[PDB]
Design a protein around this ligand. Structure first.
Ligand SMILES: Cc1cn([C@H]2C[C@H](O)[C@@H](COP(=O)(O)OP(=O)(O)O)O2)c(=O)[nH]c1=O
Ligand SMILES: Cc1cn([C@H]2C[C@H](O)[C@@H](COP(=O)(O)OP(=O)(O)O)O2)c(=O)[nH]c1=O
Ligand SMILES: Cc1cn([C@H]2C[C@H](O)[C@@H](COP(=O)(O)OP(=O)(O)O)O2)c(=O)[nH]c1=O
Ligand SMILES: Cc1cn([C@H]2C[C@H](O)[C@@H](COP(=O)(O)OP(=O)(O)O)O2)c(=O)[nH]c1=O
Ligand SMILES: Cc1cn([C@H]2C[C@H](O)[C@@H](COP(=O)(O)OP(=O)(O)O)O2)c(=O)[nH]c1=O
Ligand SMILES: Cc1cn([C@H]2C[C@H](O)[C@@H](COP(=O)(O)OP(=O)(O)O)O2)c(=O)[nH]c1=O
Ligand SMILES: [Mg+2]
Ligand SMILES: [Mg+2]
Ligand SMILES: [Mg+2]
Ligand SMILES: [Mg+2]
Ligand SMILES: [Mg+2]
Ligand SMILES: [Mg+2]
Lengths: 133, 133, 133, 133, 133, 133
């Protein structure tokens, strides 16, 4: 049994895909254990969340997008939740994400890509600590 | 123009219908203003939410049900949101709830009825203050 | 509390709507008690099922349709299941069947109308005994 | 037996509901006879389509909306198609449109209401001639 | 043209996914040729069905699960039905089953995995003989 | 930003999957820029469209199928639309097309395979010129 941190990104709100995304996770039998809605996430939590990318060319553009509308931060629990939800999520690059995945079916951009999911046990603990201190 | 208070009830979690219900409201173009997840709502909060029912024979049984699993409380905003969401919700009684409504399609019990929605301007003000003080 | 008899009619098979119809009843939380698949129902069984219509001008044409492809017969159980499933079914006449109902959303003909459901306690008893002696 | 004229309005394109709307009509078993895509309909065509509303206070605002994005115009054929598609469409007013209908489930505005459908035999003849001369 | 044997497992009933699963197969254009509902499958047919696993550590636990609620046994027919339905089914291991498959989208356990499908021409004949003697 | 040519094939009309297919493309955020409905495509445009296959064993059978009912020709626009829509489409061979793709989920035949999509930048320009001269 693991916990992972998911963000529903502002493009999901703009495109009315919030329930579509949450539903794919719900249907796989993962359970919500914490959830917060942010009308606009503070820039500082976004920069902390994406700290590994802070020196990347896309960092500022990505943070700008992440504060451009609401987000939901959710902690999901289930056996091997981290890797399983990453598989459901799909590749960042829309030339790579597979049909059947969230990004493969619904996203068409490397930045506006609908959903964040923790990529490891340690990053899940880190991200949970940011959004649910 | 109006804000209303919605609860996603514990049966929605048991039956994995959280996204289904939220999605029906989302597709109608209502905006989330606030959202809280409760692993278990305090009984007192439930009793206050249903204070107008305190003399009804079903009061305690309904409170027991409402603390039997998680709840999500949501404030939705939209023109005439209160009455519109009530119509989407459907009648309490499963003999009457209309196909096409949330309860009409998904609920089969007078108590385990998936969703609460404020019934008026006066009660919306009260309920929002209870769940989001 | 009540048991009702449902038939999934041959048009549902032709139009690949079997799961769609069954799913609407399933989502309403009704329990399957018995289920039979018929590659072709015997005409006599159909005539007995519709015996109250034997003097109607449509009787033979309706029997012809009912033996034109497969049928699934199902006994569903639930509180007040008979009237509830009738309301989900929708009116026979495509001028009247309400959007949100099975027929309202999916049927466009008075005869090729996808689904049978018992109309009363008395007829449910009779029909269950016909299909599941 | 009857032919009716449907417009998929610019809000359906903005909100990515084109297939959702078309699918509801398709599932009802109506046949497409003609279909045109308009990147932007000429304003004059819109004014002619709504000529009976020319004296209403909303006339110009509604025309502005109708040329604000793409439209698909469709001729559908079926027995009593005109009234049946009107019932699927739902009432103009979001205080009244019934859950289960296109507008009841998906529209939340009197003007941005997703879909036009001819209201009578007389108007269907006129509208088909406007969109498909 | 081949026939394959599918079981809808008790977790599908518990989670109200019976029609969801049958629908995925229906949408791929496979046809039902036999179907039986079992309120509780006899233990002996379950042990016969899974005879290859009789000496495995998981055999008893799996049989226990398979008699823990209802099942449906279905024979499906279509060109290369066996391999095609196995592909739709997805890997037993939820760390392996791909998004888009039945198990990839809906199952989260190696045992409670929603659906059985025959794995070969000879096992299909064997399994059909068990459930439809 | 690229444009690609899609045909919705006659089997989609027969099986009432037109909106299902268009919806998968719509949900991926591709936009319609041209669309025509053909009650029956002229044989000559079909032969031109499939000119690369003119000497193949299956050419005539395929053309026969392509004029056996209506089609829709659609031009879709978006970043890397050509390759992305080809990935959504799935392999021609139903022993190869992956669950999650249009053909993987919905097609069960190498010829009656629901959808055409251009396979390259140059073939997209060629095909657009045929259907939208
Ligand atoms: C790699 C990459 C990421 N991003 C943005 C979108 C990503 O969701 C976010 C974090 O990158 P990353 O951790 O690689 O992606 P993922 O979201 O799949 O875990 O940074 C870009 O805008 N451009 C890029 O080239
Ligand atoms: C009327 C009624 C309500 N209840 C419970 C379920 C209702 O959602 C809750 C409040 O009743 P009420 O406000 O009448 O219903 P609604 O939720 O449709 O506004 O009380 C019962 O348990 N039994 C009953 O007979
Ligand atoms: C009234 C009517 C029924 N029928 C057929 C279709 C009906 O499902 C069947 C039984 O009629 P009825 O019991 O009136 O309808 P329902 O199925 O809604 O209970 O007879 C016709 O073919 N033509 C008709 O005019
Ligand atoms: C009545 C009304 C209509 N309209 C617009 C939207 C309507 O779709 C269009 C034509 O009105 P009407 O023919 O009354 O509605 P319907 O589309 O339901 O047949 O005019 C307004 O903008 N405001 C209004 O108050
Ligand atoms: C391999 C395996 C199977 N099982 C159960 C669930 C499987 O559906 C059933 C039969 O195993 P198997 O034939 O390997 O799986 P499949 O269902 O994918 O054809 O045994 C376990 O409980 N644990 C295990 O490790
Ligand atoms: C290869 C092949 C194609 N066809 C038909 C169906 C194909 O959609 C059409 C064109 O072939 P092709 O361009 O290979 O397929 P795709 O549609 O995946 O781009 O020819 C057959 O009927 N039999 C065959 O063996
Ligand atoms: Mg990452
Ligand atoms: Mg109330
Ligand atoms: Mg009757
Ligand atoms: Mg009008
Ligand atoms: Mg096996
Ligand atoms: Mg090709």
């Amino acid at each position: 049994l693991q916990r992972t941190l998911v963000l529903i990104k502002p493009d999901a709100f703009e495109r009315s895909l919030v329930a579509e995304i949450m539903g794919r996770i719900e249907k796989k039998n993962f359970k919500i254990v914490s959830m917060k809605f942010w009308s606009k996430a503070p820039r500082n939590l976004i920069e902390q969340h994406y700290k590994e990318h802070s020196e990347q060319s896309y960092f500022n553009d990505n943070c700008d997008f992440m504060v451009s509308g609401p987000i939901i931060s959710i902690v999901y629990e289930g056996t091997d939740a981290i890797s399983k939800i990453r598989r459901l999520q799909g590749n960042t690059n829309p030339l790579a994400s597979a049909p059947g995945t969230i990004r493969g079916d619904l996203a068409n951009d490397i930045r506006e890509n609908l959903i964040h999911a923790s990529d490891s046990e340690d990053s899940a603990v880190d991200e949970i600590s940011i959004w649910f201190p």
